[model samples]
Target: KTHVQLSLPVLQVRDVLVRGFGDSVEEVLSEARQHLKDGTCGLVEVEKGVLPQLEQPYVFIKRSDAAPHGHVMVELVAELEGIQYGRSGETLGVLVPHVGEIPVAYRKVLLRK
Candidate 1:
């Protein structure tokens, strides 16, 4: 029930726009996938009465190839961050853990033997 919206613009895609209620792009992608499966994406709603059967308040963009998968677009649905092993942690800094996907070797050496 948090008021957070995150969105990502896929530069690679030709015309794909994805968005959802989440704190990060990763979350929106997750929701989109689920919607695609269950056919229940909150993105659109159904109307009542005897006029229109459905009410779509949202628009679906196209997908491109230049951008990475699950990265066409992103929209936040909640405002939750810096909690439960947050990236910011309890202090300010210029870097966050695992910012770069270094090789496993780097992790082992930095963490332990």
Candidate 2:
């Protein structure tokens, strides 16, 4: 089996990366999204949606739990530099502007040695 690895900053909000669980990494992201419209884990939000165009965008999972760390992906979009917007852009950890925001899943945090 071929394995891929990449490094990225931890995503605070669900916007950064979307994760999926399954036997194959290729199927996880899409599979996990399948449950979004109906509300996964009893949660609902504007960003949490199932859009065909937005489905399965590129993403990197910086953190994980189970072996092989289930599949994960992140949307790659351009954001205007903060200074361009003046004070409003000063917000730290603010998501990149322009690109649409994503939903954050309230899930467990994994701490491994």
Candidate 3:
């Protein structure tokens, strides 16, 4: 109802270490998924007694859209890009892979029997 009705989120110290990533997102998910599932996810609590009821922090993998799924409804979950590290340094741009739904047939290509 009022303007001040809502509150802000806390800026708690994450106690985290520097992180790293790779060239292909899906390529790493093979092992990365396993590590997180094993609680090697940097969670160390359970001193019991109202045990840090604070919801465990989420470690969202910045998943690049591997392929355009036709029927799946998607939502934009807020993201970003940086210029310091992966920016165009010595070259003009990076060469990420891509795919499309097209074929030179139907009436375009010569019959390849």
Candidate 4:
């Protein structure tokens, strides 16, 4: 029997939480990007996004329904990318993110419990 895990060699590992719906692993990120640019992904920026201000990535979902408890909390995450200048590395860059769910036909829909 082996004494231990041999220092866990350079086996690359990455937990991809989000990826292009129908793109191959090699071009998933690439295609998803193209979709966003084409406005076919239902991705759009939120105006004056939140309160207390957020410091990191996040995601959420709100139901399309009547008033009262208008804010139905649902787990959400943000898709972000790091950008910067190689020269000074000190620039106030403007970055805007987008997220949205487009109305697509579904074979079945779930009901509230």
Q: Give the candidate number with the greatest TM-score.
A: 1
- Worst window of 10 by summed lDDT in candidate 4: 4-13
Q: Model 3: clashing residue pairs?
A: none
Candidate 1, residues 1-113, lDDT tens digits: the string is 22112122122111113223344544544544454334233222112431122212122222211223233222212122322221211110011112122222210000000
Q: What tens digits encode model 4's per-residue C-alpha lDDT throughout 7-111?
A: 101110121223123323224334433443444332222234331142222221122223222222111122333321112211111111223333222111111
As a whole number from 0 to 100, the lDDT of residue 20 in candidate 2 is 23
Q: How far does residue 27 in candidate 1 sit from its true spot (Å)? A: 0.6
Higher-TM-score candidate of 1 and 2: 1
lDDT of each residue in 2-106, candidate 3, tens digit only: 111111111112332322123333433333334433323222212343113222221222222221222111111111232122211122111111122122211
Off-target runs (Cα >4 Å) in candidate 3 are 1-14, 21-23, 42-113
Model 1, residue 62: C-alpha shift (Å): 1.5
Give candidate 2 regions above 4 Å deviation: 1-20, 41-113
Would you list the clashing residue pairs of candidate 2?
14-104, 58-74, 59-73, 59-74
Clashes of 4: 3
Root mean square deviation (Cα) for candidate 1: 18.1
